[PDB]
Design a protein around this ligand. Sequence first.
Ligand SMILES: [Cl-]
Ligand code: NA
Ligand code: NA
Length: 257
Amino acid sequence: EPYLSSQNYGELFSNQIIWFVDDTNVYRVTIHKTFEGNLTTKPINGAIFIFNPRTGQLFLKIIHTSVWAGQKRLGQLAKWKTAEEVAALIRSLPVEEQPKQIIVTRKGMLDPLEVHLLDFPNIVIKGSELQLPFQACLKVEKFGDLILKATEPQMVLFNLYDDWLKTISSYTAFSRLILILRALHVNNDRAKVILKPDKTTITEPHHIWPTLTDEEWIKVEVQLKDLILADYGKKNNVNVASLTQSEIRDIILGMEI
Ligand SMILES: [Cl-]
Ligand code: NA
Ligand code: NA
């Protein structure tokens, strides 16, 4: 499976078009109370996240619950549907915009993609030793509201780097994005506080993330990193002070240490 690693991910920022494909939340449920009072779940709209780490481009394919109607083994179906939708997107693009590499968030996507991309034999499909939680996008109201409200499947295009590439590298933007996503992933409440340093902190309507000065981003990034390491340390009973620089890099990236 896992070719992408914390020691070769510099590759991500070169000339080949690369997509991460996350199928984690294609078939999706929410917790709800039955009015009768009891706790249980109900299926809600899902999404495929398809992400280019150099450009910041996000293809968001909303999956309406109607696809599940009358089907068994929804976990399996979700994987096969994701592969079908990724293949469809590739075919819809001119050859010069088609990816050369697909990196799957989950190994379960390896085989379905191989089968659907049988007519694109030179596309490399690989797993990742990292664990980049694109699912944390669901905790961003913009995305959470859009997916939940959908009445039909649809593709919506976004960019997860906002205007950052005007002043910082893809690597630096990726590193910022991963800090944001992993922080949201592990502690939604604390991350959103960190991402709102001033009462005047706002996000532009055409953006995903707050408008912050260069200096404000530095502080945010320190605080997010601090949150991720403390959370990890608590979960794994490891003292943060004991961590090496390399271990810290691995933790942020979601890699096993
Ligand atoms: Cl760059
Ligand atoms: Na992984
Ligand atoms: Na700026």
